[PDB]
């Protein structure tokens, strides 16, 4: 069985808030100027350290441990960059025009230019951060959305009756997160019509986050194939799961 379906909305929120990964610092060295390689090195080293915490976090998302290790691997393989990005956009909300990759690595788009091909991704991330700011996205809504990404992004890339039963479990958990989002909006006093309008506005942003992740994956693949930076063995495997051209 699954204990995630019997969780209330408040218990869902509390579980997800306590599961939140820490904010990590980058290995930024202020003694040397930026190059394309050294900035790509900072960003990939930070992502690699965040991945370890992401895995711990995913195991605390209700319903995730109920899955086989193969299904867990697949979901994290599909969603990891979306998850890093929605976290980055969340962290940057109160920094208009800047991306807070880390507290000691707060960059504007002009600093992003030193990595060619990143400035388009940079601009999209800023636009997403500004959208969340204009919407006044709350922390409890943010953790719901991040968990939806983890459960949703790989769900539609799974014949056997046990596989259709595990996909049904994932969709039952996603429905619980929907109930939780609606519960949070009603508790904040939004009218019934405002609740479904805001739920739609938030979920449509996930398509832009999917878009940004795909563009980011192609950029990371380019940096690997041009020998710009060495990728950790974990980052190479997370990249190879997307099978780019």
């Amino acid at each position: 069985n699954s204990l995630a379906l019997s969780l209330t909305a408040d218990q869902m929120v509390s579980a997800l808030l306590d599961a939140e990964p820490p904010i990590l610092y980058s290995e930024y060295d202020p003694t040397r100027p930026f190059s394309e390689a050294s900035m790509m090195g900072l960003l990939t080293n930070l992502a690699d350290r965040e991945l370890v915490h992401m895995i711990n976090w995913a195991k605390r998302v209700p319903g995730f441990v109920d899955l086989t290790l193969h299904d867990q691997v697949h979901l994290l393989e599909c969603a990891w960059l979306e998850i890093l990005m929605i976290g980055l956009v969340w962290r940057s909300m109160e920094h208009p025009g800047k991306l807070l990759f880390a507290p000691n690595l707060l960059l504007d788009r002009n600093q992003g230019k030193c990595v060619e091909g990143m400035v388009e991704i940079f601009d999209m991330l800023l636009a997403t951060s500004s959208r969340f700011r204009m919407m006044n996205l709350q922390g409890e809504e943010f953790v719901c959305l991040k968990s939806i990404i983890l459960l949703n992004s790989g769900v539609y890339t799974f014949s056997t009756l046990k596989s259709l039963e595990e996909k049904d479990h994932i969709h039952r958990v996603l429905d619980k997160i929907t109930d939780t989002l609606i519960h949070l909006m009603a508790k904040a006093g939004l009218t019934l019509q405002q609740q479904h309008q805001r739920l739609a506005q938030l979920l449509l942003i996930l398509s832009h986050i999917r878009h940004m992740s795909n563009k980011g994956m192609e950029h990371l693949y380019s940096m690997k194939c041009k020998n710009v930076v060495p990728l950790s063995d974990l980052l190479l495997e997370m990249l190879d799961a997307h099978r780019l051209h």
């Binding site: 370890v52 895995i55 711990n56 195991k59 290790l69 867990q72 691997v73 994290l76 393989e77 063995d233 974990l234 495997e237 997370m238």
Partner: peptide
């Protein structure tokens, strides 16, 4: 024996 599969077990 990929890295992600191993990290998902250690805790």
């Amino acid at each position: 024996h990929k890295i992600l599969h191993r990290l998902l077990q250690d805790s």
